[PDB]
Design a protein around this ligand. Structure first.
Ligand SMILES: CCCCCCCCCCCCCCCCCC(=O)OC[C@H](COP(=O)([O-])OCC(O)COP(=O)([O-])OC[C@@H](COC(=O)CCCCCCCCCCCCCCCCC)OC(=O)CCCCCCCCCCCCCCCCC)OC(=O)CCCCCCCCCCCCCCCCC
Ligand SMILES: CCCCCCCCCCCCCCCC(=O)OC[C@H](COP(=O)(O)O)OC(=O)CCCCCCCCCCCCCCC
Ligand SMILES: CCCCCCCCCCCCO[C@@H]1O[C@H](CO)[C@@H](O[C@H]2O[C@H](CO)[C@@H](O)[C@H](O)[C@H]2O)[C@H](O)[C@H]1O
Ligand SMILES: COCCOCCOCCOc1ccc(C(C)(C)CC(C)(C)C)cc1
Ligand SMILES: COCCOCCOCCOc1ccc(C(C)(C)CC(C)(C)C)cc1
Lengths: 68, 55
């Protein structure tokens, strides 16, 4: 269907590709290496529960007062 | 005759006690629920689910 040149990526000569840099002494920084710096939220979960309760309650209070 | 009188008196007393205490308690409950329904920050089990019931 397609020629071998198209499959292998070169007509006559295979060109050398420059390898990827590593930056020895530190972690790689790529779009896929970001969980090393940003994990899932784990520090303020209980505060999340409390604040969701208080937000629901205060919103319900003011909505009922406005409606009434 | 005073036996009949005392029986009637204490029967009427028990009836009044039951009726009026039930009615007053229910009335206070309804007024509190009206206050809390009109103020939903307070429409919460503020004493507790079992504490108030046990008391
Ligand atoms: C249940 C539906 C999802 C079940 C399975 C999916 C799942 O749980 O994945 C975890 C998923 C993600 O994990 P997460 O980081 O813990 O999310 C934060 C919680 O949603 C943060 O909320 P919470 O779960 O920590 O507590 C909030 C609290 C809030 O309390 C209230 O004031 C609600 C009062 C209701 C009356 O509600 C409750 O805990 C129970 C009351 C019913 C809700 O959390 C949920 O989806 C469950 C809560 C979603 C509630 C709103 C959904 C719309
Ligand atoms: C909104 C921003 C997305 C927050 C995703 C958190 C993250 O660091 O990302 C981490 C999450 C998954 O983390 P895991 O490695 O634990 O599976 O998503 C990704 O891996 C790539 C997210 C790309 C989008 C960046 C914006
Ligand atoms: C099948 C029925 C008949 C129809 C046939 C034609 C179908 C064409 C649609 C498929 C196209 C696929 O297209 C494909 O693209 C990639 C890029 O990702 C090319 O990839 C090429 O170049 C890259 C870099 O650019 C090289 O690293 C790789 O070695 C080389 O394969 C493929 O050589 C090509 O095949
Ligand atoms: C549009 O959104 C703006 C996004 O901006 C990204 C901000 O990036 C700044 C990040 O700065 C740092 C630098 C170092 C670090 C350290 C090395 C301290 C983190 C560590 C110890 C967890 C790896 C964390 C954050
Ligand atoms: C969900 O994520 C969105 C925002 O992502 C931010 C990712 O930020 C990570 C930044 O990576 C760094 C980490 C440290 C550094 C410094 C300069 C602080 C490192 C150092 C001092 C070792 C050279 C630079 C970039």
């Amino acid at each position: 269907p397609l020629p071998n040149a198209v499959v292998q990526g070169y007509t006559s000569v295979r060109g050398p590709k420059r390898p990827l840099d590593h930056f020895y002494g530190r972690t790689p920084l790529n779009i896929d290496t970001l969980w090393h710096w940003v994990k899932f939220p784990h520090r303020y979960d209980n505060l999340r529960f409390a604040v969701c309760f208080w937000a629901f309650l205060v919103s319900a209070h003011f909505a009922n007062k406005k409606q009434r | 005759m005073n036996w009949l009188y005392q029986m009637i008196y204490y029967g009427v007393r028990m009836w009044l006690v039951f009726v009026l205490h039930s009615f007053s308690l229910g009335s206070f409950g309804e007024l509190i629920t009206v206050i809390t329904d009109n103020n939903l920050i307070f429409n919460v089990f503020y004493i507790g689910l079992l504490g108030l019931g046990f008391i």
